[PDB]
Amino acid sequence: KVGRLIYTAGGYFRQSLSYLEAYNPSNGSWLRLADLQVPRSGLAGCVVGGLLYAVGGRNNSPDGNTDSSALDCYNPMTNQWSPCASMSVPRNRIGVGVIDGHIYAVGGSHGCIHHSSVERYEPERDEWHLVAPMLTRRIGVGVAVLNRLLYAVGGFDGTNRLNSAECYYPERNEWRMITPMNTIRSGAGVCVLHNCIYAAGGYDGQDQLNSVERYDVETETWTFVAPMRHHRSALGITVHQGKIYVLGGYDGHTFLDSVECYDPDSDTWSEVTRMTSGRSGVGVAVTMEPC
Ligand SMILES: O=C(O)CNC(=O)c1cccc2c1-c1ccccc1C2=O
């Protein structure tokens, strides 16, 4: 369990960013690691087999906006990125979850197209294949996995921001709606902790949110927990050692550098560190420290 860092890849501040930086909760330090090959915001991160994957996003630059179909892999042992097979379609504002060593890429946008499509990557074969699409088109969708079921939460369908959510049952290759959230949220941070799917922050169509709610997969209810100190949309999120970490985002005024940590035992958030610069739209995951 020792030696794991919170990695943050990419993001947005004025333009899309190539940064890869890693935070060590055990000593408060940050390390700057190898830049992404292509800057990207609105991507997702995940880890399989100790390797960090950066999935989708968009490169916003002075010279254009390019939605990404890319999958790239970072090996902490070498501090190098390597390209993997690309997805079937570009997916900005994507959601990603891992089931049994396979990466699921969910939703996202390609220009004015809002995807319902979903595809699954097999690292051993370096191949993607499409699976059943969601029941709803969703960009800015939060995704998490609990008990080998994949959840897609909230987002924006091209016309409305969503409080709806749905679950994918892999053995049936089928999606079903679950109870909707109490709050409409696009660009929330979605993760799993214990028996619940958390949705933190986001944008409800009027304001960036500090509220946080959790879906108990047994009781099928959404319950609010303590709110974050800061309102934030387009935040990064992960779980490490039984606590939720939220990173950056936009509060309606500033691109935040603050990282807050949720302790479920006390139902409290605390500010634990700051990123080296404020940014939104990062991908985040946890794996072993580099070199
Ligand atoms: O739709 C979503 O999911 C979240 N949107 C927002 O919260 C949002 C709303 C109005 C203006 C802006 C943003 C925003 C979010 C992230 C980076 C920059 C901006 C930005 O200028």
Swiss-Prot record:
Documented effect of changing R58A: Impaired interaction with SQSTM1/p62. Abolished interaction with SQSTM1/p62
Kelch repeats: 5-50, 51-101, 102-148, 149-195, 197-242, 243-289
Effect of gene knockout: Early postnatal lethality caused by abnormal cornification. Mice survive until weaning and probably die from malnutrition resulting from hyperkeratosis in the esophagus and forestomach that cause gastric obstruction. Defects are caused by constitutive activation Nfe2l2/Nrf2, leading to constitutive expression of phase 2 detoxifying enzymes. Mice lacking both Nfe2l2/Nrf2 and Keap1 reverse the hyperkeratosis phenotype and are healthy and viable in normal conditions.
Post-translational modification: Non-enzymatic covalent modifications of reactive cysteines by electrophile metabolites inactivate the BCR(KEAP1) complex. Accumulation of fumarate promotes the formation of cysteine S-succination (S-(2-succinyl)cysteine), leading to inactivate the BCR(KEAP1) complex and promote NFE2L2/NRF2 nuclear accumulation and activation. Nitric oxide-dependent 8-Nitro-cGMP formation promotes cysteine guanylation (S-cGMP-cysteine), leading to NFE2L2/NRF2 nuclear accumulation and activation. Degraded via a proteasomal-independent process during selective autophagy: interaction with phosphorylated SQSTM1/p62 sequesters KEAP1 in inclusion bodies, leading to its degradation.
Stated consequence of mutating N60A: Impaired interaction with SQSTM1/p62
Domain of life according to the entry: Eukaryota
Subunit description: Component of the BCR(KEAP1) E3 ubiquitin ligase complex, at least composed of 2 molecules of CUL3, 2 molecules of KEAP1, and RBX1. Interacts with NFE2L2/NRF2; the interaction is direct. Forms a ternary complex with NFE2L2/NRF2 and PGAM5. Interacts with (phosphorylated) SQSTM1/p62; the interaction is direct and inactivates the BCR(KEAP1) complex by sequestering it in inclusion bodies, promoting its degradation. Interacts with NFE2L1. Interacts with BPTF and PTMA. Interacts with MAP1LC3B. Interacts indirectly with ENC1. Interacts with SESN1 and SESN2. Interacts with HSP90AA1 and HSP90AB1.
Protein name: Kelch-like ECH-associated protein 1
Native organism: Mus musculus
